[PDB]
Design an enzyme around this catalytic site. Structure first.
Site, short mmCIF file in Angstrom:
data_model
loop_
_atom_site.label_atom_id
_atom_site.label_comp_id
_atom_site.label_asym_id
_atom_site.label_seq_id
_atom_site.Cartn_x
_atom_site.Cartn_y
_atom_site.Cartn_z
CG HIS A 103 -78.47 7.04 14.59
ND1 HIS A 103 -77.35 7.08 15.37
CD2 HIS A 103 -78.59 8.26 14.02
CE1 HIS A 103 -76.82 8.29 15.30
NE2 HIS A 103 -77.57 9.04 14.49
C1 LIG Z 1 -86.59 15.89 12.95
C2 LIG Z 1 -85.97 14.63 12.36
C3 LIG Z 1 -85.66 13.56 13.16
C4 LIG Z 1 -85.07 12.38 12.66
N1 LIG Z 1 -84.76 11.38 13.54
C5 LIG Z 1 -84.22 10.29 13.04
C6 LIG Z 1 -83.86 9.24 13.92
O1 LIG Z 1 -84.02 9.29 15.13
N2 LIG Z 1 -83.30 8.12 13.36
C7 LIG Z 1 -83.07 8.01 12.04
O2 LIG Z 1 -82.54 6.97 11.66
N3 LIG Z 1 -83.37 8.98 11.17
C8 LIG Z 1 -83.94 10.08 11.64
N4 LIG Z 1 -84.26 11.13 10.77
C9 LIG Z 1 -84.00 11.01 9.32
C10 LIG Z 1 -82.57 11.25 8.96
O3 LIG Z 1 -82.14 12.54 9.33
C11 LIG Z 1 -82.37 11.09 7.47
O4 LIG Z 1 -82.92 9.87 7.02
C12 LIG Z 1 -80.91 11.16 7.06
O5 LIG Z 1 -80.29 12.35 7.55
C13 LIG Z 1 -80.81 11.09 5.56
O6 LIG Z 1 -79.43 11.03 5.14
P1 LIG Z 1 -79.07 11.47 3.65
O7 LIG Z 1 -77.68 10.97 3.45
O8 LIG Z 1 -80.27 11.06 2.86
O9 LIG Z 1 -79.15 13.06 3.70
P2 LIG Z 1 -78.89 14.12 4.85
O10 LIG Z 1 -78.35 13.42 6.06
O11 LIG Z 1 -80.16 14.89 4.98
O12 LIG Z 1 -77.74 14.94 4.11
C14 LIG Z 1 -78.10 15.82 2.99
C15 LIG Z 1 -77.17 17.02 2.96
O13 LIG Z 1 -77.06 17.57 1.62
C16 LIG Z 1 -76.96 18.97 1.70
N5 LIG Z 1 -77.40 19.55 0.45
C17 LIG Z 1 -78.67 19.65 -0.08
N6 LIG Z 1 -78.66 20.14 -1.30
C18 LIG Z 1 -77.32 20.36 -1.59
C19 LIG Z 1 -76.64 20.84 -2.73
N7 LIG Z 1 -77.23 21.18 -3.86
N8 LIG Z 1 -75.29 20.90 -2.68
C20 LIG Z 1 -74.66 20.53 -1.55
N9 LIG Z 1 -75.19 20.04 -0.43
C21 LIG Z 1 -76.54 19.99 -0.52
C22 LIG Z 1 -77.76 19.38 2.91
O14 LIG Z 1 -77.08 20.52 3.38
C23 LIG Z 1 -77.60 18.18 3.86
O15 LIG Z 1 -76.52 18.39 4.76
C24 LIG Z 1 -84.82 12.30 11.28
C25 LIG Z 1 -85.14 13.40 10.47
C26 LIG Z 1 -85.66 14.55 10.99
C27 LIG Z 1 -85.95 15.71 10.05
#
Ligand SMILES: Cc1cc2nc3c(=O)[nH]c(=O)nc-3n(C[C@H](O)[C@H](O)[C@H](O)COP(=O)(O)OP(=O)(O)OC[C@H]3O[C@@H](n4cnc5c(N)ncnc54)[C@H](O)[C@@H]3O)c2cc1C
Ligand SMILES: Cc1cc2nc3c(=O)[nH]c(=O)nc-3n(C[C@H](O)[C@H](O)[C@H](O)COP(=O)(O)OP(=O)(O)OC[C@H]3O[C@@H](n4cnc5c(N)ncnc54)[C@H](O)[C@@H]3O)c2cc1C
Ligand SMILES: CN(C(=O)[C@H]1CC1(C)C)c1cccnc1
Ligand SMILES: CN(C(=O)[C@H]1CC1(C)C)c1cccnc1
Ligand SMILES: [Br-]
Ligand SMILES: [Mg+2]
Ligand SMILES: [Mg+2]
EC number: 1.8.1.12
Lengths: 483, 485
Positions: free
Chosen positions: A459
């Site tokens: 992705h």
């Molecule tokens: C610049 C960049 C580029 C990337 N490019 C890619 C890519 O091309 N392909 C890929 O596969 N991955 C990529 N990633 C990684 C990807 O974004 C993450 O692995 C993914 O978003 C993680 O999903 P998650 O469900 O762990 O958390 P996230 O998707 O980060 O969701 C966490 C959410 O929890 C919320 N939150 C935090 N604390 C609290 C709280 N106490 N209460 C309520 N809400 C809270 C935040 O607001 C956030 O919206 C990239 C990351 C970055 C930073």
């Protein structure tokens, strides 16, 4: 002289066969072709159709054609430049393509020079006797004998040739052969045929046409690209149209004459007329067997003109084999290459192997392109009690911003719903030809839809759609569609 | 009262939520701090990928690609006034912003048009092992917007850029602020050798005003640790060929504002450089703090990520963690897979564990990386005999294009004992698209002979994967050699 193998045609299949027999099985090999480099008068030459007037030049030219879309699309991403300074210099493209093709011609020449026991003969090969190939000055069997080659084994690999309908004013029409050498890009052009060559060229001409130019594609039938997935056929018709190509379906040229200014006047069987600078006939390719004098050895032909072969590429005559387009099976360079490899291993390796013509990944370099492997749903519906179709169609995000909101990516997986086995995968959109390659390996491994869905996505990509379809869109049960 | 309460409406959190609700007619609350992208909290409804990751990054790398396409077009006969070419960054960001907002709105749609599934706004923390408290801020002592009862609690709060505590770190940005720069920087230092630093160097490189310079610094010798070695050296070249300056064995000691607003960066080697932006991309760390993990005894790891078993279970019954908070492979599709597995396990009674091996992933570098499975170094420490198949060719189009530096690299690493594919590593245009179906091949235990017996699609870069029959070299008991004994 005397050779273990004489190959007639130095093309995709012939060079695979000839190189393998010389280098892997240490046979003494002779290969014959009508030209050492590309273009008029015989168009194909050392390298084959693909090198000289097919896959290679056409890919370079489609890549050229794609910059029309990139230049326009750059603006959504904030690129700015003087639009009115933009010219598509067709002469530079052709010159670039010609050097690229000549470089390949030259490397094949050096390959024959550098490879002991692999010998090139220039001119027209034909069968004198079941163990003697005669090489002549011209296609005409009266013409002077340049060589006579004694041959334990003979491979026919002379490929195919464009089909021109016997209509009045045929003489004012070209095939893809001449299209690669147009000195100037036509302002108005009719592509005749709904197959990959007509479509791919409609795209090429559409990008390089001078100002207020127009490209028209005509097809006898209702919907272009028969053999391809029907949703893809309809979506590709829409996206060609969105890029200013006129698709004339249920239409065929009755006749071509000249306007007094030499431009070509087209009359369609429907009483429609069109004035164009170029009519490119892309209605079919037929196997090239006329010049082979197969009468002299009694090699079994089909009425079509194809050399009939068993699954091992063997003719009715022992020690005489045919591979590639001349067999009129699947007309693709990697299939010809596979047939040549399988033959030489069979005959000279005693490693018996047939080419598998099912589940063959292939592409159309339309704008946007198609990637496909295995069965379309209509075919699968006749061979399997239960067929599932998984479908995802969506304008990708890059193409909201770009301005090409019409560029819907289509991914379709066709399965045997009884056991989840993937029968067919069909892609339309940027990347489709690159995506489908490793899908070929998946179908060789009897991948099931659960093997796709259970694979973690890359992705952001278009490809990940393949790994995100959990639930069928519709079914065929006992040949009948059911939503 | 909810069957499931999810903290974080991100890649992991939404997949779990939507699946629970729509597949097991379960009753789910999801907490996030923000409904749409950008300051103050950057991540929002949809998570890091949607708001400030994969999605806006891929749009912006696609923008950057036009620098190459406009130049390359000339090789194919495209003619225009090169002197008129401008990269309007401001346009790009406005366009990205609108694109992300539509997705924020798409996710609000989902919560609306979905029964049981409801979004709560603010800060999730744990009061007790079955009650989530949505506060008004990241202060545990802010107002209580909600008290949420939970048969099951999912922690999916993701990760956050790490900012090295050097003097003048307040003058530096993360990828978070990079997405909202009002102007494209003329001079930029991207700090880090990971994919975010590399991707952003490419973006800044295409949109830099005239007399511009992108500098990437990395603390060790070679960028992109964990990727194939051949690819790491090749990307390094191709980024250099496209005018990006790669500073290896270098790391900032501090930053000072110059009087004109620019940044004076002092390196550890004593080297200095002035840049309009210092983008720190040295690592991301799990968002553990604001959950209060003292306050119910969830155990973190020696690195700060929530400890989980293979079923995403914490030490505390009913409490799970998926995605970047687990501090493993920080990829959206891994978060998604974990969340889908967790809910199919816990509510679907169909227990299923995410496979953290043979994961296809990509670097949208210019040109890009696609990779799946083991790099040869790793394979060689696990298998007695390892074969490396390698093909490295400048594809024809990049002869004519004038970008002869764009070599396509295709590597297949196998278990030479049985020919099983352990890893596939690609560098070149199309690598991320090519590699996806390679992921499926590796799940099916594809051997090198399944690749080479498959008929090629011609002409493609991908078909090189189906043309490699002879190892280029081997590792035997960890030791590299051209030939087997
Ligand atoms: C610049 C960049 C580029 C990337 N490019 C890619 C890519 O091309 N392909 C890929 O596969 N991955 C990529 N990633 C990684 C990807 O974004 C993450 O692995 C993914 O978003 C993680 O999903 P998650 O469900 O762990 O958390 P996230 O998707 O980060 O969701 C966490 C959410 O929890 C919320 N939150 C935090 N604390 C609290 C709280 N106490 N209460 C309520 N809400 C809270 C935040 O607001 C956030 O919206 C990239 C990351 C970055 C930073
Ligand atoms: C416009 C176009 C685009 C195509 N694009 C693609 C594509 O992208 N991908 C793909 O896989 N396939 C493509 N194809 C098909 C592909 O070119 C053929 O399938 C393939 O080249 C056939 O290989 P072959 O060995 O059968 O014959 P060829 O490669 O055509 O070789 C035949 C050779 O025999 C020579 N010859 C003929 N008669 C004689 C004689 N009597 N004596 C001596 N020499 C003789 C010819 O000069 C020629 O070099 C395309 C075809 C066309 C026309
Ligand atoms: C030559 N050819 C066909 O015969 C098509 C009918 C098909 C779909 C098998 C072709 C062309 C381009 C891509 N794939 C296949
Ligand atoms: C987040 N990430 C990594 O941690 C890389 C070190 C790896 C190779 C495991 C990543 C980024 C893009 C593609 N793949 C993997
Ligand atoms: Br039809
Ligand atoms: Mg020789
Ligand atoms: Mg709701």
């Amino acid at each position: 002289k005397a050779f273990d193998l004489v190959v007639i045609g130095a093309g995709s299949g012939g060079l695979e066969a000839g190189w393998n027999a010389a280098t892997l099985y240490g046979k003494r090999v002779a290969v014959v072709d009508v030209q050492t480099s590309h273009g008029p008068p015989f168009y194909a030459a050392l390298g084959g159709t693909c090198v000289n007037v097919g896959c290679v030049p056409k890919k370079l030219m489609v890549t050229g054609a794609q910059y029309m879309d990139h230049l326009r699309e750059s603006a959504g991403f904030g690129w700015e430049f003087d639009g009115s300074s933009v010219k598509a210099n067709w002469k530079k493209l052709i010159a670039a393509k010609n050097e690229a093709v000549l470089d390949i011609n030259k490397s094949y020449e050096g390959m024959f020079n550098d490879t002991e026991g692999l010998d090139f003969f220039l001119g027209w090969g034909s069968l004198e006797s079941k163990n003697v190939v005669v090489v002549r000055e011209t296609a005409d069997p009266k013409s002077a004998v340049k060589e006579r080659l004694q041959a334990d084994h003979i491979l026919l690999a002379t490929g195919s040739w464009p089909q021109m309908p016997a209509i009045p004013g045929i003489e004012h029409c070209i095939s893809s052969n001449e299209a690669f050498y147009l000195p100037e890009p036509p302002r108005r052009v009719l592509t005749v045929g709904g197959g990959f060559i007509s479509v791919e060229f409609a795209g090429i001409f559409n990008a390089y046409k001078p100002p207020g130019g127009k490209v028209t594609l005509c097809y006898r039938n209702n919907l272009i690209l028969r053999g391809f997935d029907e949703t893809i056929r309809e979506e590709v018709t829409k996206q060609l149209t969105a890029n200013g190509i006129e698709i004339m379906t249920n239409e065929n040229p009755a006749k071509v004459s000249l306007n007094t200014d030499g431009s070509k006047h087209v009359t369609f069987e429907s009483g429609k007329t069109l004035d164009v600078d170029v009519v490119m006939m892309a209605i079919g390719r037929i196997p090239r067997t006329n010049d082979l004098q197969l009468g002299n050895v009694g090699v079994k032909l089909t009425p079509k003109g194809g050399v009939q072969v068993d699954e091992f590429s063997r003719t009715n005559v022992p020690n005489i084999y045919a591979i590639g387009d001349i067999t009129d099976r699947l007309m693709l360079t990697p299939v010809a290459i596979n047939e040549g490899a399988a033959l030489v291993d069979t005959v000279f390796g005693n490693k018996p192997r047939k080419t598998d013509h099912t589940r063959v990944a292939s592409a159309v370099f339309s704008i946007p392109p198609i990637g496909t492997c295995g069965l379309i749903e209509e075919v699968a519906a006749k061979e399997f009690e239960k067929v599932a179709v998984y479908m995802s169609s969506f304008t990708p995000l890059m193409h909201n911003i770009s301005g090409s909101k019409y560029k819907k990516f289509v991914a379709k997986i066709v399965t045997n719903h009884s056991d989840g086995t993937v029968l067919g995968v069909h892609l339309l959109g940027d990347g489709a030809p690159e995506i489908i390659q490793a899908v070929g390996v998946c179908l060789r491994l009897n991948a099931k839809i659960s093997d796709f869905y259970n694979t973690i996505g890359v992705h952001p990509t278009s490809a990940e759609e393949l790994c995100s379809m959990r639930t069928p869109s519709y079914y065929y049960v006992k040949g009948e569609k059911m939503e």
